[PDB]
Scaffold this motif. Structure first.
Motif, PDB file in Angstrom:
ATOM      1  N   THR B 102      49.936  35.879  44.764  1.00  8.80           N
ATOM      2  CA  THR B 102      49.770  37.190  44.148  1.00  8.80           C
ATOM      3  C   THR B 102      48.302  37.479  43.867  1.00  8.80           C
ATOM      4  OG1 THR B 102      51.964  36.993  43.149  1.00  8.80           O
ATOM      5  CG2 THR B 102      50.480  38.662  42.250  1.00  8.80           C
ATOM      6  N   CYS B 103      47.575  36.488  43.344  1.00 12.10           N
ATOM      7  CA  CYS B 103      46.142  36.655  43.124  1.00 12.10           C
ATOM      8  C   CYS B 103      45.415  36.901  44.437  1.00 12.10           C
ATOM      9  CB  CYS B 103      45.568  35.421  42.430  1.00 12.10           C
ATOM     10  SG  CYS B 103      46.593  34.745  41.114  1.00 12.10           S
ATOM     11  N   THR B 105      46.597  38.198  47.284  1.00 14.71           N
ATOM     12  CA  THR B 105      46.898  39.526  47.811  1.00 14.71           C
ATOM     13  C   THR B 105      46.248  40.619  46.972  1.00 14.71           C
ATOM     14  OG1 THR B 105      48.983  39.621  46.584  1.00 14.71           O
ATOM     15  CG2 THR B 105      49.044  38.721  48.828  1.00 14.71           C
ATOM     16  N   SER B 106      46.197  40.436  45.650  1.00 14.94           N
ATOM     17  CA  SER B 106      45.503  41.398  44.802  1.00 14.94           C
ATOM     18  C   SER B 106      44.026  41.470  45.159  1.00 14.94           C
ATOM     19  CB  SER B 106      45.680  41.025  43.331  1.00 14.94           C
ATOM     20  OG  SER B 106      47.013  41.243  42.905  1.00 14.94           O
ATOM     21  N   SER B 107      43.399  40.314  45.390  1.00 19.00           N
ATOM     22  CA  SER B 107      41.997  40.303  45.790  1.00 19.00           C
ATOM     23  C   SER B 107      41.802  40.962  47.149  1.00 19.00           C
ATOM     24  CB  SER B 107      41.467  38.873  45.806  1.00 19.00           C
ATOM     25  OG  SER B 107      41.272  38.390  44.490  1.00 19.00           O
ATOM     26  N   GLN B 109      43.654  43.348  48.506  1.00 24.99           N
ATOM     27  CA  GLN B 109      43.807  44.790  48.349  1.00 24.99           C
ATOM     28  C   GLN B 109      42.602  45.402  47.647  1.00 24.99           C
ATOM     29  OE1 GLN B 109      47.073  46.042  45.864  1.00 24.99           O
ATOM     30  NE2 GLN B 109      47.367  47.937  47.028  1.00 24.99           N
ATOM     31  N   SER B 110      42.104  44.746  46.597  1.00 21.08           N
ATOM     32  CA  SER B 110      40.943  45.266  45.884  1.00 21.08           C
ATOM     33  C   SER B 110      39.712  45.301  46.781  1.00 21.08           C
ATOM     34  CB  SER B 110      40.677  44.427  44.636  1.00 21.08           C
ATOM     35  OG  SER B 110      39.508  44.864  43.968  1.00 21.08           O
ATOM     36  N   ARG B 118      37.597  42.392  40.802  1.00 24.15           N
ATOM     37  CA  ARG B 118      38.784  43.045  40.272  1.00 24.15           C
ATOM     38  C   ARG B 118      39.108  42.500  38.889  1.00 24.15           C
ATOM     39  NH1 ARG B 118      43.095  39.572  39.994  1.00 24.15           N
ATOM     40  NH2 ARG B 118      43.179  37.945  41.600  1.00 24.15           N
ATOM     41  N   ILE B 121      44.670  39.421  36.313  1.00 23.90           N
ATOM     42  CA  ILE B 121      46.112  39.610  36.255  1.00 23.90           C
ATOM     43  C   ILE B 121      46.730  38.374  35.611  1.00 23.90           C
ATOM     44  CG2 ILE B 121      45.982  40.987  38.357  1.00 23.90           C
ATOM     45  CD1 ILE B 121      47.406  38.754  39.823  1.00 23.90           C
TER      46      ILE B 121
END
Lengths: 628, 449, 79
Positions: B102-103, B105-107, B109-110, B118, B121
């Motif tokens: 999750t971290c 994929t968040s990175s 996307q950001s 970013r 989370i």
RNA sequence: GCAAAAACA
């Protein structure tokens, strides 16, 4: 490892350079140094006797020991007084020109050294701020303390500084300007105190080591004895300072004779030496050359003080109850260093016999060399700290064995104790190693301990380029690098230099130059490199104008003396720029004013030292002369 | 001049006075000594037994591949990867929980949205060890029992892994690209031409190899990570590892995520979450890695996630990993120039048969392959540098010298308690490449006639 | 049979600040309850709390999303 | 988790 040992067209000696952990991170010391310092302190007491009796050894004071007691099967601390005297006599009788030049040094230029050179030293633990300060700050604070608590002005010579230390040490009470007071015993303990710290960036061994630095009060004595040792070492063929290995390599022996070659190291080199042996050596040399008595005390005080060292034992031993950890000073709970509990003095600890790294790396070499000088040792020896190489030139194999054994025994006489596992002897000469150099037949190979950084130094583009190219040139000159290696290293340095100064890809500097039609004309701007392997000793600006790669108008623009921003063989330019509870940041700024008025008035200080007698207000004498 | 009580201060810890005057006659006594010994046997290094040591390095090394992306900037490639892929976990490790995807994929996307840094989370809590020191300290205080004792640290011994030989043989593989783009210097004299020709030949004989690509990946990743550690932050930063082949396409080696990293000391660790494109997964080689399946354009890729903390000094050192090319270049240049000094002829294409010990046999092989394997082994040694490697190499220099001496028909003598193999053996604990070098030394003959 | 639990006579694991924490989880975290005994206390097949009839279970992202099988309350002390 | 004779988290 089988890939590092060629059998054709090239010998393993040259490829032994591959047996180096270059380009990898150097080991870094973590945590408390207390265990390492305690082990360093306890090793000499464990080797004094053949049978290990630590407790009996804590009260020995002078480390002199009788024969038939030196451990010949292992490490042995201490020394034999008669052996030291005889070996010092033998060393003094030989190398007469070295002794004469030592006499010249000690008579003429000894009372000439400026005491300000103690500022270019190492980190110092201040006895007033109770913390670590840079050497110039410690020197300034110490001389202010001397002025306040002694009332006689310190002369420019460091003999005056030593006399001031000796005189102030006899006062029962001293007070610094704040306004903190020191007792005589407190000041004496502070002088005895040795600040120990981890030795960083040390490659070549599994275990970390600790080094100790002396207090500024004793540093003048340490520096004078070290300078005398260096001066006498530069003029003896058996020293480890100069081409000695190459000189002994270029030697032809008898056609049919045994020619040995012993290369080895020293184990526990700083854990088996006693300052009393150095005292005896220096006193013998001084007495047989004919110096006065005050010279005797001046040269004997440093080891006298070092015999009462109070090396700090770090922050404490590590104790674990469960998953918790705690730092506990020695003596709070039982451990493996219980025998030194009685010697704990506050945070420090007392050890009469023993040594520490970073204190006397030259007098130890002198002691080893005086051990070398004997009668039956008819060989060639080169000594440098804990590393040595010896050449045996005799007629019989058993003669060579006897010479090697008596060399080991004589080294043990003063407590050098060369490592049996680290010493290798070859029956025919031709292969050996000393320092980081390697010997094979008539060729000696210099292999660096560290590769060149190959990165900009970090001051300004011109300076960084000059220093990088000079470092590469020095590396190639010493034989460590050749055509291909030099060119590859300078290409790598060029890439790193261009990256570090925003000259690669798209960045703020490149976009600014592109949008304003600024053509990159220098290497740091992004232009093609002008330096080559042959031309790496030339300045960038000077080389570009000859090739027509830098227009004279551009030189006029950049080399303008009226420029907003303004060995290093780089001309000043617009690219020569400087990157942007203490209670001491104010006095460095007010010292800046003192340094600012100078170098604007005196061209002379930019040439030689500030040799102006008196000159407290007296600076007005020059300004009036300027008007006149 | 000297004072009165100052002399007492000096003398209170020594038997002699300030100026010693020994009353013993100066003489050197005769002390019985042992007999110097001689060895026929070359030292045989003990091989540590136990579990095979896993892969402990900042990056993956041999198992490093890239995703070919359409030509564009870093943001374009990251957006393409994030918008054209789905992630499903294959292998989960307790060291690296699968929730850190999750971290990652968040990175991704950001970074695709033009934000390399970013906000934090919840999954970032167990991804960078946030408040792990306080957690461990309070848990230990709550569960503390017994009495204090000495630390008595211990290092577990491990055996030689089977993948070290696989690593060495896989880094040899040929590559289509050069992977070494160093800007040439100027040429003014013929000796400069000689040097540049030597460097060009070395680059073209080692450039098209997997080890060169891995070196480039290491350099880029370490440089990008190091360039962000200086700014003291509290938010996650993303540093993609992307190269360009000589056609414009983007090669995505992976991404490294940098945590809050409130670093103070130059040796302090910095939290990292490294995502890498793996070729083949192995349980015993990557026990602390979490391997995820990656699906881009109906192609198969393996994504490996590991939780690591890495100091600023080590990252700076590995940002200059390109310096590892010097020593193989040194060997190649020395061989070439020896076969130019033999007959005053610089051929620049000499490929001598270098004789070595292979699988306990004496056979010869080309210089180019030898230089390639030297470069691979030097890279493996550089990425696995620790006190064990330092001590092992330093104490192996002596055995190497002795082996050379006994190959050159010389006799080696030793002192009484001389066991040179002990100092090498004490440095062989769990380093895979130290064990590999020890086995390589052991495979060679120990007797020379 | 060492108690290892409050109802078995072991020392209290709960404190004033840990009123909200479950006993078994807190004991596991503090090491007062080893994994070998945890594998026995929290057995979903223990006879002590076994149910008389099979129960249905979800299966997230499976070909068959519902599986029916015999079940027991995980804790053997929830009799 | 990194790292080895204890520091970061």
């Amino acid at each position: 490892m089988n890939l590092f040992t060629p059998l054709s067209e090239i010998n393993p000696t040259t490829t032994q350079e591959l047996l180096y952990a270059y380009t990898g991170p150097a080991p870094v010391a973590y945590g408390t140094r207390t265990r390492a310092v305690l082990e360093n302190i306890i090793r000499p007491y464990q080797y004094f006797y053949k049978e290990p009796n630590v407790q009996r050894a804590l009260d020995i004071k002078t480390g002199c020991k009788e024969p038939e007691d030196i451990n010949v099967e292992g490490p042995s601390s201490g020394f034999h007084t008669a052996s030291v005297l005889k070996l010092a006599d033998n060393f003094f009788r030989k190398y007469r020109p070295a002794m004469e030049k030592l006499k010249y040094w000690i008579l003429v230029k000894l009372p000439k050294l400026k005491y300000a050179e103690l500022s270019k030293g190492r980190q110092t633990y201040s006895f007033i701020h109770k913390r670590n300060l840079p050497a110039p700050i410690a020197l300034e604070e110490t001389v202010e303390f001397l002025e306040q608590n002694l009332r006689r002005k310190i002369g420019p010579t460091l003999l005056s500084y030593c006399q001031a230390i000796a005189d102030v040490m006899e006062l029962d009470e001293t007070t610094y300007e704040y306004t903190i007071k020191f007792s005589r015993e407190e000041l004496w303990d502070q002088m005895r105190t040795l600040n120990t710290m981890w030795k960083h960036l040390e490659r070549g061994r599994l275990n970390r080591r600790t080094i100790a630095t002396p207090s500024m009060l004793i540093r003048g004595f340490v520096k004078i004895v070290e300078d005398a040792a260096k001066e006498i070492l530069e003029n003896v063929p058996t020293s480890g300072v100069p081409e000695k290995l190459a000189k002994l390599a270029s030697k032809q022996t008898f056609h049919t004779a045994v020619t040995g070659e012993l290369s080895g190291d020293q184990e526990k080199f700083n854990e088996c030496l006693d300052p009393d042996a150095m005292r005896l050596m220096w006193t013998v040399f001084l007495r047989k050359l004919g110096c006065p008595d005050w010279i005797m005390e001046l040269f004997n005080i440093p080891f006298m003080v070092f015999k009462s060292k109070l090396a700090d034992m770090g922050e404490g031993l590590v104790y674990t109850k469960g998953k918790l950890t705690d730092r506990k000073p020695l003596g709070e709970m039982p451990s493996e260093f219980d025998d030194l509990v009685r010697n704990v003095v506050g945070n420090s600890i007392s050890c009469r016999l023993g040594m520490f790294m970073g204190m006397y790396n030259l007098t130890s070499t002198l002691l080893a060399l005086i051990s070398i000088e004997r009668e039956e040792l008819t060989g060639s020896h080169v000594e440098s700290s804990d590393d040595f190489i010896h050449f045996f030139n005799c007629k019989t194999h058993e003669e060579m064995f006897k010479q090697a054994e008596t060399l080991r025994l004589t080294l043990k006489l003063v407590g050098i104790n060369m490592s049996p596992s680290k010493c290798i002897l070859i029956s025919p000469a031709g292969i050996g190693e000393f320092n980081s150099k390697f010997h094979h037949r008539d060729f000696v190979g210099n292999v660096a301990t560290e590769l060149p950084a190959l990165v900009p130094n970090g001051t300004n583009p011109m300076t960084d380029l000059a220093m990088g190219l000079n470092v590469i040139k020095h590396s190639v000159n010493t034989g460590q690098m050749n055509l291909c290696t030099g060119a590859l290293a300078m290409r790598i340095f060029n890439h790193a230099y261009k990256y570090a100064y925003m000259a690669l890809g798209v960045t703020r500097r490149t976009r600014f130059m592109e949008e304003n039609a600024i053509t990159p004309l220098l290497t740091n701007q992004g232009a093609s490199p002008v330096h080559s392997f042959s031309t790496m000793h030339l300045d960038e600006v000077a080389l570009r104008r000859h090739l027509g790669l830098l227009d004279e108008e551009t030189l006029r623009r950049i080399l303008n003396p009226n420029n907003p921003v303004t060995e290093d063989y780089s001309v000043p330019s617009c690219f020569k720029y400087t990157l942007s509870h203490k209670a001491l940041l104010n006095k460095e700024e007010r010292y800046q004013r003192v340094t600012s008025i100078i170098n604007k008035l005196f061209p002379e200080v930019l040439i030689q030292e500030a040799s102006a007698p008196g000159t407290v207000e007296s600076l007005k004498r020059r300004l009036e002369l300027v008007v006149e | 001049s000297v004072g009165t009580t100052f002399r007492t201060l000096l003398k209170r810890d020594t038997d002699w006075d300030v100026i010693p005057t020994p009353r013993v006659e100066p003489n050197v006594p005769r002390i019985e000594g042992r007999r110097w010994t001689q060895m026929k046997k070359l030292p045989l290094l003990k091989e540590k037994e136990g579990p095979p040591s896993p892969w402990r390095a900042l990056l993956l090394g041999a198992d490093s591949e890239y995703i070919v992306c359409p030509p564009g900037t870093d943001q374009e490639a990251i957006s393409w990867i994030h918008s054209q892929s789905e992630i499903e976990c294959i292998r989960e490790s307790k060291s690296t929980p699968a929730s850190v995807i999750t971290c990652l994929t968040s990175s991704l996307q950001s970074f695709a949205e033009g934000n390399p840094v970013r906000s934090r989370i919840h999954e970032d809590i167990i991804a960078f060890g946030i408040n792990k020191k306080q957690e461990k300290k309070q848990s230990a205080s709550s569960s503390a029992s017994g009495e204090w004792k000495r630390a008595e640290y211990q290092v577990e011994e491990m055996s030689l892994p089977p993948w070290v030989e696989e690593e060495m043989v896989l880094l040899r593989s040929d590559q289509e690209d050069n992977w070494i783009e160093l800007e040439k210097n100027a040429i003014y004299t013929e000796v400069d031409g000689v040097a540049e020709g030597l460097v060009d030949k070395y680059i073209e004989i080692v450039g098209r190899t997997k080890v060169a690509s891995v070196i480039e990946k290491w350099q880029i990743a370490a440089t990008r990570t190091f360039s962000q550690l200086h700014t003291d932050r509290s938010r996650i930063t993303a540093c993609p590892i992307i190269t360009r082949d000589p056609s414009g396409n983007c090669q995505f080696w992976g991404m490294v995520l940098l945590g809050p990293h409130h670093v103070k000391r130059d040796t302090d660790n910095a939290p990292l979450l490294i995502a890498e494109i793996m070729g083949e997964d192995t349980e015993e080689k990557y026990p602390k890695h979490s391997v995820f399946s990656l699906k881009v354009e109906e192609k198969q890729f393996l994504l490996s996630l590991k939780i690591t903390s890495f100091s600023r000094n080590k990252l700076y050192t590995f940002s200059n990993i390109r310096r590892v090319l010097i020593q193989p270049a040194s060997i190649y240049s020395q061989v070439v120039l020896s076969r130019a000094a033999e007959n005053n002829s610089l051929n620049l294409e000499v490929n001598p048969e270098i004789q070595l010990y292979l699988e306990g046999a004496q056979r010869g092989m080309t210089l180019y392959q030898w230089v390639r394997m030297i470069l691979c082994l030097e890279f493996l040694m550089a990425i696995y540098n620790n006190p064990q490697m330092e001590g092992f190499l330093a104490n192996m220099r002596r055995l190497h010298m002795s082996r050379h001496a006994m190959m050159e028909r010389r006799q080696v003598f030793l002192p009484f308690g001389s066991r040179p193999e002990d100092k090498v053996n004490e440095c062989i604990i769990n380093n895979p490449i130290v064990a590999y070098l020890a086995k390589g030394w052991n495979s060679m003959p120990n007797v020379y006639y | 049979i060492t108690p290892l639990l409050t109802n078995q006579g072991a020392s209290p694991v709960h404190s004033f600040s840990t009123m909200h924490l479950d006993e078994v989880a807190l004991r596991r975290h503090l090491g007062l309850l080893d994994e070998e005994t945890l594998r026995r206390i929290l057995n979903p097949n223990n006879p002590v709390t076994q149910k008389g009839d099979p129960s249905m279970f979800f299966r997230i992202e499976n070909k068959m999303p519902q599986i029916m099988e015999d079940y027991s309350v995980p804790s053997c002390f929830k009799y």
